[PDB]
Amino acid sequence: TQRYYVERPIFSHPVLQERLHKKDKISESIGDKLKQAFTCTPKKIRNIIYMFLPITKWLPAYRFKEYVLGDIVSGISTGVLQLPQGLAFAMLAAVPPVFGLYSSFYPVIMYCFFGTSRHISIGPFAVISLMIGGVAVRLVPDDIVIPGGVNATNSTEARDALRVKVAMSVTLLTGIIQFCLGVCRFGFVAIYLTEPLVRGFTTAAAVHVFTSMLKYLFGVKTKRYSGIFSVVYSTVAVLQNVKNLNVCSLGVGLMVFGLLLGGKEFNERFKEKLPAPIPLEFFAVVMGTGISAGFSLHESYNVDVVGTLPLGLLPPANPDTSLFHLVYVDAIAIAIVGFSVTISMAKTLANKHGYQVDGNQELIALGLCNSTGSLFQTFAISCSLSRSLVQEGTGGKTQLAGCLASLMILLVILATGFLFESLPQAVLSAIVIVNLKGMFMQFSDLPFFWRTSKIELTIWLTTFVSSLFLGLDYGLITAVIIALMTVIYRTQSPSYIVLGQLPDTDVYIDIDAYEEVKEVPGIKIFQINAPIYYANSDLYSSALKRKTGVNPAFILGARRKAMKKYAKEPIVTKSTLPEELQRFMPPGDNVHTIILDFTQVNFMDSVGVKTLAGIVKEYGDVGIYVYLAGCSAQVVSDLTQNQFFENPALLDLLFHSIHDAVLGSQVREALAEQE
Amino acid sequence: TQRYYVERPIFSHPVLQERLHKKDKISESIGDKLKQAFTCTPKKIRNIIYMFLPITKWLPAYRFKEYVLGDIVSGISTGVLQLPQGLAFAMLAAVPPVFGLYSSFYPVIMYCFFGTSRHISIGPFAVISLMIGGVAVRLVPDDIVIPGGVNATNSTEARDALRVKVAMSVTLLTGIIQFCLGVCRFGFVAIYLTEPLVRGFTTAAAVHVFTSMLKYLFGVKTKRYSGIFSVVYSTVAVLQNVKNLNVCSLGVGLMVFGLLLGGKEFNERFKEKLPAPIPLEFFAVVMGTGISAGFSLHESYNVDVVGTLPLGLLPPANPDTSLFHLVYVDAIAIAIVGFSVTISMAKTLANKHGYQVDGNQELIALGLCNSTGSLFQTFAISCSLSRSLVQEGTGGKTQLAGCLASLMILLVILATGFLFESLPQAVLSAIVIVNLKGMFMQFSDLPFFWRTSKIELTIWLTTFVSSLFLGLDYGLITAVIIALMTVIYRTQSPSYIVLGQLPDTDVYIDIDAYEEVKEVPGIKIFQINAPIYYANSDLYSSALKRKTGVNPAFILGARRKAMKKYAKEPIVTKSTLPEELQRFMPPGDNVHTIILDFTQVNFMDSVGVKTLAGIVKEYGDVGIYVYLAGCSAQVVSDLTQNQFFENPALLDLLFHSIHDAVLGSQVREALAEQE
Numbered sequence A, B: 001t002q003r004y005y006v007e008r009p010i011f012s013h014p015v016l017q018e019r020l021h022k023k024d025k026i027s028e029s030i031g032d033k034l035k036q037a038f039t040c041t042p043k044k045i046r047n048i049i050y051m052f053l054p055i056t057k058w059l060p061a062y063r064f065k066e067y068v069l070g071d072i073v074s075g076i077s078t079g080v081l082q083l084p085q086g087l088a089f090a091m092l093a094a095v096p097p098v099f100g101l102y103s104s105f106y107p108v109i110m111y112c113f114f115g116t117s118r119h120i121s122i123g124p125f126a127v128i129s130l131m132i133g134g135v136a137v138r139l140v141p142d143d144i145v146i147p148g149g150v151n152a153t154n155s156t157e158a159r160d161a162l163r164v165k166v167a168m169s170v171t172l173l174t175g176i177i178q179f180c181l182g183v184c185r186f187g188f189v190a191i192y193l194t195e196p197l198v199r200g201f202t203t204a205a206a207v208h209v210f211t212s213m214l215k216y217l218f219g220v221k222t223k224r225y226s227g228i229f230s231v232v233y234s235t236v237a238v239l240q241n242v243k244n245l246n247v248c249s250l251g252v253g254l255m256v257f258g259l260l261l262g263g264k265e266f267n268e269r270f271k272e273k274l275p276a277p278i279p280l281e282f283f284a285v286v287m288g289t290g291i292s293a294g295f296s297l298h299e300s301y302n303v304d305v306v307g308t309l310p311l312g313l314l315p316p317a318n319p320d321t322s323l324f325h326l327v328y329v330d331a332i333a334i335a336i337v338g339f340s341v342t343i344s345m346a347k348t349l350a351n352k353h354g355y356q357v358d359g360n361q362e363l364i365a366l367g368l369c370n371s372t373g374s375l376f377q378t379f380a381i382s383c384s385l386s387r388s389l390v391q392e393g394t395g396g397k398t399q400l401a402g403c404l405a406s407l408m409i410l411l412v413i414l415a416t417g418f419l420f421e422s423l424p425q426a427v428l429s430a431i432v433i434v435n436l437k438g439m440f441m442q443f444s445d446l447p448f449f450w451r452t453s454k455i456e457l458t459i460w461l462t463t464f465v466s467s468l469f470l471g472l473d474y475g476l477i478t479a480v481i482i483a484l485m486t487v488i489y490r491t492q493s494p495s496y497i498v499l500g501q502l503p504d505t506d507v508y509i510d511i512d513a514y515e516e517v518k519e520v521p522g523i524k525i526f527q528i529n530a531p532i533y534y535a536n537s538d539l540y541s542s543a544l545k546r547k548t549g550v551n552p553a554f555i556l557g558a559r560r561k562a563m564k565k566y567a568k569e570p571i572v573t574k575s576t577l578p579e580e581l582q583r584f585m586p587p588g589d590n591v592h593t594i595i596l597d598f599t600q601v602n603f604m605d606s607v608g609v610k611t612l613a614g615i616v617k618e619y620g621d622v623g624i625y626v627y628l629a630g631c632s633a634q635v636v637s638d639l640t641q642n643q644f645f646e647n648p649a650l651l652d653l654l655f656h657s658i659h660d661a662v663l664g665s666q667v668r669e670a671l672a673e674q675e
């Protein structure tokens, strides 16, 4: 009881207004501040070039102790991881794996020259490949064959060319759309991707990938399904055809699957901190191809194989621009999904070590990479989560690991040629399924969100459900919209409390919470921690009339009944209630004024102003004063703009704090009946 | 300087926590409070019957001085207004006007028995009629004729029966949907219809009605258009065919139009306060039919006529229930639009005089009326704004005016028969166009909303644009969604301010606003009036780092540069910055602590907790204390649920008010370097 001495006069609001003054701080040349730009300043031009060419700024910094070794090992690991699942992703899109090698090689080099994040991997990804394959299958069916060809029993060449052309058109459209969005400053919209939303979306994507690749794991041909309820159709189709499966492919697939799982757990347990982690996937693919070649499994048991792999490089070609009037919506979906995934991964990795990534620059770089890849026979690309985690978890410090991976894939595509020819698809399926474990383990957020807050749990569950059973684009859009309406719900159900004063102090807290706070006699205090706008205006009035226990309509009805039963034989804002006042007053409270807390109110609109005016008018008509405490500048401005401060007396109702309102009410009551 | 004496010790938060105690107030039998319901209490049963049968409660109150006269005149006016525009609305739906008379008669009686609002009119409405006509035309075209009929040159009878059957099926589906929504407590969702949204929607509807009825006014046959860009197609079609028009219909239409306009303005100016307003529309229709009969305009000039009107009553019939698998979406649209319009009108009229209307009860009553009307050959109904305003503006005090209108329309449909036979459609078009003036005048809200607040103006303009050029249902849904996203935008761009202390007091206000507030030496205060959640977490941190002028990264870089240049030859939360401290300190501020205002923050989530933890960690690493002032119970609970209060020292950072934080910082600084 030694500090916090105030001794200050009552500050209603006109008193504080006349106590203060005003400043101007008026800016000049409004709307023309940018007319001084585009000058010959060397610093500004240097900054612009640095912004649009990230490769220039992050390059002189080049140490040799551990940077080179870490970058080299990260490049080795990311290349040996990108090769087999790159082939698998190409194979998932009804396109030969050579285009997967092209997607692994071409755009990585360009993203090295254009890229803000320094720990992100670039490749074919999974969801993008699935959508490309679905579009190619739908637009070019497997039954329509032009008879003016080879006139053989079976021909699967013109169909492949048509699918490639469709994929190229879609990729070019996606790249153009991404570039246009990046230039137009549309990269700002990535803050709406909440963490549970991303977690649920990625878990649903992992489930989709697992279900899709199960059929290749078994080795049974099944027609491709795409659209609403795609996963359930695919799983019922594969379960219906479990019989007549291939035993050899299943056996080798489970063998490599178990080998990968055991090796990963052993490496996690083994003291490989000082050494470099071994390439499990590279060893797996080498062993698989060696066994298949040594046992001649293509004809001994009729197992599926990767097929012939042309050896060389192919000159650039101009893609068709006449199919755009059928593949415009799906291109938008691909661009949106890819941008969201890559920006989420980049932002998650950036906050970890030291820096922050730009949003629009990544979009522009991705669009440039997509367009130029489409120019060089390459389908759409995005950020792959597993490769990014591997690169970060190995020692990568820049995008030079991507360059090393590009050199590795160039060596593969110009040197081996025939080495990766006898490779069963079962090992690829096992590799992808094993890699899916990291995203499968993300189910642990259910109990944590159940314990912490049910809102995040609801967002997670809604995203997972809408992205699993329904489509992927529709799921993402609906999840974002629901992640937005969650805020409206949260502000539509606030916590109404009645305040009480701590003894001989100025602290007002919840009345039914601490057992030693008492109501000020004749005064009731109400608090709402939410803005008062159109969606929340009647609920506030109802809660005020109910929780405090003072209902003006009931008082008016009771008084009218009392008057009826007794008889047996330029602006005024406040009016007293005439009453005979002998014995008809009901036994209850004797509240004379109500104080409203407005410190927690952020904004108000016309509906809120109207409802406050109605509340004030009704309570003045009954005979109870109403005061507002703690109104901020924004709320005062909103009240002034609407026709509220006509000032018969309404300008004197405002107060700076709850204690000021209480003291003003007490002194006003003391001035009456005692003077 | 006489009042407001406090003299209270510093209340950080642990001090206040140990100063207080706790209560329980634990409820019992959670989730079983409703198991005591459905009892034999006479009061509860009486209240339930009153709730589900409004007609019982509001009936004994029956005075005779002015109630009877006002109700009678209101009924007269509403009936004479409902007849001609009822015929016009039936005619707009490609249905004979007899069904319009049925829609005027049948459901009004039932809404009298089921209805909360006591000043609302019931009838066919305009938008509903347009949608019914569009559906009937689309599903049953005007070119498909079954050859197995009369085999005449022209037959327009089976097509009419098909259109009637389609309308009946749609009406039955709408009634069923409305009843199901009303029972399921879905009537709560009407608070999202903001006033500018309703104004813009009604203005767009009025424009649609005017454009649609212009072609009937001219007298030129044109094919009906429905869908996206319907209004522009209709207007270009009617303007393309302005030639070969009918002069007689145009002449009579402008004659009656001018008569109505002049009569309405005269009545507004004339002292008809004591007398009863004359039925302008009834006189207009009487004069029109008299002139048409006396001049034989059907064959003298080939003008369009209402046609033959069968005289009698028709027995109930069971409608087809096999077309529901084509007319389910449009039924939903009709139900939603009708409910929204009627609830908006009822809520606007209810707040005026004395009472409030229920939401679910109106929905249930409307659904019952729609279904039973569909049983008795009646298309969909809703609330008509013009009739409601006329009934309110005449002296109506209950729904008995609807009963009088029902008796009037029964008299018309069983008595006249041949009287309203020679009636040109031009007079109906003029009557509807004249009635549209009230909704056309609603354009005056543009300057008011431009002056008051641009948010309401944006909502108004977006609703008008999306409901005029685009469809009506799509416009309404998109307008509701955009009105919802407005709140997200508003909370995404708050006002960041830096506070300053008034001399020798405890009032802290905007520093650059009043010219006599000074910064506390060595202390900076930041305030944000918005919740800190996922969509607004990085902007808050950036504003805090920029506006205050203390950037931790810049300080770290400068100190590292100084150290580099000088050399020429179980948990700890706060660490001091080691420095040689001779001449390398930059000339600037000397802030030692930062106080964050949290009175205006309503809620927080995981992202906000993470960003506050990051801010605190960074500023502690640099060497600046961070305090939080005014945190509420909800914010404290949100911080506790997430892993924030691990309590190395973080539990002592909280403070009850800004002045408490300032005093604590000052005493903490005084305790050092002086003791």
Ligand SMILES: O=C(O)c1ccccc1O
Residues within 6 Å of the ligand: A125, A126, A127, A202, A205, A206, A209, A384, A385, A386, A432, A435, A436, A439
């Ligand atoms: O890399 C994959 O196979 C993958 C697929 C879907 C979701 C997350 C992923 O890492």
Ligand SMILES: O=C(O)c1ccccc1O
Residues within 6 Å of the ligand: B126, B127, B202, B205, B206, B209, B384, B385, B386, B432, B435, B436, B439
């Ligand atoms: O009654 C009408 O004709 C009308 C039509 C559209 C909008 C508002 C209206 O009052």
